[PDB]
Structure 1
């Protein structure tokens, strides 16, 4: 057998690791399938995409078109349906009718061999009619056949009967396909909506306590959930909820010795009170956890738990499974590091003595939390554990529970970040916090919305407990507003860490991205009621952004994104589309100074002609404008961080 088939169909995309891992989508998401399709000689080709669902049933007729003339690159948009493992194939074929029509349109007016030409047409159309399933379509084609063969009609009339719009519509749906050749099937993994789209809020339950009991419980933290749901969040991400070690517990501001009252770091998991399958006693019991999960569910909030495969020196694993750790020649275990960061309060796990034991235990733990309603896991530092370990763990969990979503917190080099997404992580943290200039945002979002979208789903956290960017430090509230608009409108998934709304921006020291008095090392009570009363919170903006996202399908997808030129370096403009919904955003990246700019819209990318003027509504203010190809904007920090406009 030959590698190339009768009609060449080559380099089908998307493809991930040469077909060894699936391309990704979620239910209702569109993307392009493409291929290089051509044939020998000068006659025309056609192509179509066959999508097969998890039961092997083919999807609808999906013809492709040549994407640019003379390139031989063909494409079609497909839309993912129900969740599961699908496949896609490109079918390529000679299109003899298109070729015959091209020649007949020339030869018939010229009087060149008109009887042969028309009989040749008649034979193609009768072959077309024989493959057509519907009676009325067949009759339409056969009437064209009879007209083509009718020697009593003028040549031009015989030809015209074969080129009618009604004949065209039949042949667009059921073309005559010669020498049909298929690509080898490629896999598509279709996952639930939340894998791509959702707003996330991170907070520490222990910080939501009372004057009588400063250490919050699941019951006290549950009373924070209504405010989180009212800001329009969908997912609450909790730091580790397990007992915390005492040996080498860290003190406040990342100091090495805890005092007697110090709470330690939740990531220093494990004590004689229990490990990763247990609840910190000060948070309450598993029954209290269940209450928290249930109250979250009532308010439209899913819980994401941190899963950090590491432990404190007091974790039961340390003496039960010594082979899960690297021991130095004196028998001791070195503390974990992620240079220049040091984690003196924990041991890292070693994987090569007992990989099977570790995987078995990992999936036991995850299934325990899954049985208590946790269907999302934020996986801590996955890039410091083996790639194939995650591949195995995720395949095991998703094999019985395909709805479970894993988020990779891998702030590392591009090859590792991409590979983790490709081996099964549904979502990835990103470089978003370090992309702040127009050039940085433009380049990075062009990457994320391009080929990477076949395997990676970005979660844009504007801050985390480990990342307070200088932009926020120096820009104050106007900068928090800008980064919220950007995160919420550039990615279908975004998030914030509690305190972002209050514009907390005091760093540990100059040149650090750590918070002063970080919540990782201490209880951090916040007077939410006071901040709301005093108007010192951007919760209203956050709430509005989430409402805009919920009302505009364009903001609930990733791949359709276009940057429009402006004449100011500090002003960025972009549009997103989904069906008839178009959102147009203009952001002033300068948190200190008012910017005036001309935004020049690429009108064809909005589906409009260059001369058109179309109404927009800025959803942040309710103000309506009329914008054409060139529009003045004025954006003032503290009043108008951005325009977030719908086309009406």
Structure 2
């Protein structure tokens, strides 16, 4: 038993954990399958990819090509179909016809061995016709065989009868493959479109109240849903909707002692009113929640609930399951931390006394909300809980409900972030907010669109309730406009947290990424009507970006992305492609000064020739341009963040 087959097929990619975890795709997504393929001697080889659906049914004939000269690295693009677990193999084989052609095109014109050479080609084409299924094809090959053996015609006439485009066609479909060798199957997990592509919007229902009842309900907060859908979003992400503890409840601006009417942080879950399977009483009943979900569904909006595996000191688990927490010698439970951040209002979970009870209760809670229409969960801080626990929980839920999507809020070191996606997490938060220079964005997006794309799907939130980057603080509305362009065009999934449209950017203090008067600790009513009428919102820009994404398949994928050089450090340029759709973006990363630059596009990367010129339409303005290998641009902050151009037919 040899590790290597007759014709070596090695190091098939993509591969996750040496084959023990699946590579990932979504319905209709294209990606490259590659392998190292070669043979002994100098004769030619060929290779093809066999992608099998969940029932074992192979896909179309998919031949591979050597990706670079002298590397023996071969590749071919496949497209994922319906959801489920697929498999793919690589088949390699001797290519006797190419070998005989290449050498017959030398020996016949120079009179060497012609009768012996032409008869050798007749014997090959004969073996080729034996493995050809259709009879019209089978006679096209036997006609070339007979013409090859016709000693009464010139040798150049006999040879050329086997090198015609009509013999090219049969062989480019049913080629003669020698010593066919196969790799071992590699698994592929195909999931639904929303796992890769979608626009996300986060807001606090309790903030959308009334003058008489300032604490909003699910029934008042449902009034925001039409505006959210009108901005082109597909997913509404809600902070925890459960009762909030009173013991050590935090006050406004993250103060230790709440006073009077303070509402506390929604992530300090649990009170005598209920736990993770309960509704905050100021938000209404489980019946109102169904109404909210139903109204969201009518507008094309899916709900994503926050899942925070933690407890306030008043959560029922504290006395019903004391072994789910670590107790110090005096019996107290230390509050959760994530340094240098401290959460004096919550307890972390201990997983090693009763791991089965925790997993059983966790999937029960998730299935409760799944029964009420929640098919997406934003998982709070997964990296402070055991990695294997999430692997077990995700596999349990997806085993019965493969449509459920899990998003990992893991802002941590690279190894943990990769592993969490590799063990099941459909989506991952990223380093996006901390990549603001051209070098940072080019390097990070090269990483996310490269090998990481076989297991990680990025969700680019331009802001979060805990992340107001110094770029937005110092750049004002122009900064908000640039980050929206970048996030919406660089990832097929992007999102914002309410208030971003209004360019809220007052930090807690200098050096902090917290908002002043953070919504996490207080109701935040907003004059949405006045901002629209006074034009002080970038919702129109947000709306246009989502329209452009809904209209251009290139912005609904991740792996096809290429950066084009500019002569200005503040100006970045890149393109993305999907079939015949090509989008080109040029962004001025300077929010305070106008920048002009030449954009030297990589034309073969666009499928064009260096001399060619193409018409483009700036989808932000409707203006038409004609662009070639060198293009002048002038971008003024406030007036224009970027050009978002589509290539016209």
Same fold (TM over 0.5): yes
**Distance across 1 between alignment mates of 2:384 and 2:181:** 45
Q: Shift of residue 149 of structure 1?
A: 1.3
Alignment size in residue pairs: 648
Cα shift readout 1:123-173 (whole Å, capped 9, x = no counterpart): 111111111111111111111111111112211111101100110111111
What is the match of residue 529 of structure 1? 529
* In 2, Cα distance between equivalents of 1:322 and 1:180: 61
Root mean square deviation, CA, Å:
0.5
Distance 2:150 2:318 in 1: 91
- Which residue does the alignment assign to 1:382? 382
Superposition TM-score, scaled by structure 2 size? 0.99
Give the 3-state SS of the residue equivalent to 1:162 in structure 2. coil
User: Is the partner of 1:328 in helix, strand or coil?
Assistant: coil
Q: Map Cα deviations across residues 206-243 of structure 1 (whole Å, 9 max, x no partner).
A: 00111011000000011100000000000000000000
SS in 2 for 1:151: coil
Aligned equivalents of 1:430, 1:265: Cα separation in 2: 24
CA deviation vs aligned residue, 1:531-553 (integer Å, no higher than 9, x gap): 11111000000000000000000
Unaligned runs of 5+ in 2: none
What CA deviation, in whole Å up to 9, does each residue of 1:548-591 have, x standing for no partner?
Answer: 00000010000000100000111000101001111000000000
Distance 1:230 1:198 in 2: 15
Greater shift in the superposed pair: 105-114 or 437-446:
105-114
**Equivalent-residue separation in structure 2 for 1:236 and 1:432 (angstroms):** 20
Deviation at 1:430, TM superposition (A): 0.2
Q: CA deviation at 1:322?
A: 0.9
**Secondary structure at the counterpart of residue 51 of structure 2:** strand
The alpha-carbon deviation at position 110 of structure 1 amounts to: 1.8
Deviation at 1:351, TM superposition (A): 0.5
> For residues 155 and 385 of structure 1, what CA distance do their matches in structure 2 show?
75
- Kindly state the Cα deviation for residue 114 of structure 1 after the two structures are TM-superposed: 1.3
| 2:61 is the alignment partner of 1:77 | no
Secondary structure at the residue paired with 1:626?
A: strand
Q: CA deviation at 1:307?
A: 0.3
Distance 1:50 1:628 in 2: 39
CA distance in 1: counterparts of 2:509 and 2:277, whole angstroms: 37
* Displacement after TM superposition at 1:103 (Å): 1.2
Residue 386 (structure 1) shift: 0.6
Classify the secondary structure of the residue corresponding to 1:46.
strand
Q: CA deviation at 1:320?
A: 0.7
Matches of 1:304 and 1:361 in 2, distance apart? 20
- Measure how far apart 1:402 and its partner are: 0.5
Deviation, structure 1 residue 112: 1.4
- 1:448 Cα deviation (Å)? 0.4
Give CA-to-partner distance per residue, 1:2-31, whole Å, 9 cap, x none: 000100000000000000000100000000
Write the distance in 2 (CA, Å) between the matches of 1:151 and 1:294: 80
| TM-score, normalised with respect to structure 1 | 1.00
C-alpha separation in 1, matches of 2:603 and 2:235: 36
Residues 34-87 of structure 1 show CA distances to partners (whole Å, capped at 9, x for unaligned) of: 000000111110000000000011111000000011110000000000010000
Larger CA deviation: 112-121 vs 7-16: 112-121
Q: How far does the alpha carbon of each residue in 1:594-618 deviate from its partner, in whole angstroms, 9 at most, with x for none?
A: 0011111111111110011111100
Structure 2 Cα separation of the partners of residues 137 and 453 of structure 1: 41
Distance in 2 (CA, whole Å) between partners of 1:294 and 1:639 is: 39
Shift of 1:193: 0.5
Separation in 2 of the partners of 1:354 and 1:555?
Answer: 45
CA distance in 2, matches of 1:197, 1:174: 37
Residue aligned with 1:51, SS = strand
Q: Could you list the per-position Cα deviations for residues 228-276 of structure 1 after superposition, in whole angstroms to 9, with x for gaps in the alignment?
A: 0000000000000000001110000000001120100000000111100
Give 1:116 shift. 1.4
SS at match of 1:632: strand
Q: Secondary structure at the match of 1:334?
A: coil
1:399-439 superposed Cα distances (whole Å, 9 cap, x missing partner) = 01001000000000000000000000000000000000000
For 1:109 and 1:509, the matched residues in 2 are separated by 82
CA distance in 2, matches of 1:274, 1:436: 42
Distance in 1 separating the partners of 2:455 and 2:169: 36
How many angstroms apart in 1 are the aligned matches of 2:52 and 2:582? 30
Q: Deviations over 1:332-364 (max 9, x none)?
A: 100000000000000000111111111111100
Deviations 1:284-318 (A, max 9, x none): 00110000000000000000000000010111111
Q: Give the whole-Å Cα distance in 1 for the aligned partners of 2:122 and 2:253.
A: 84
**Alpha-carbon separation, structure 1, partners of 2:142 and 2:284:** 78
Q: Cα deviation per residue 1:414-470 (whole Å; 9 max; x = unaligned)?
A: 000000000000000000000000000000000000000000000000000000000
Please give the alpha-carbon distance, in whole angstroms, between the structure 1 residues aligned to 2:442 and 2:102.
Answer: 44
Determine the C-alpha separation between the residues in 1 that align with 2:280 and 2:511: 34
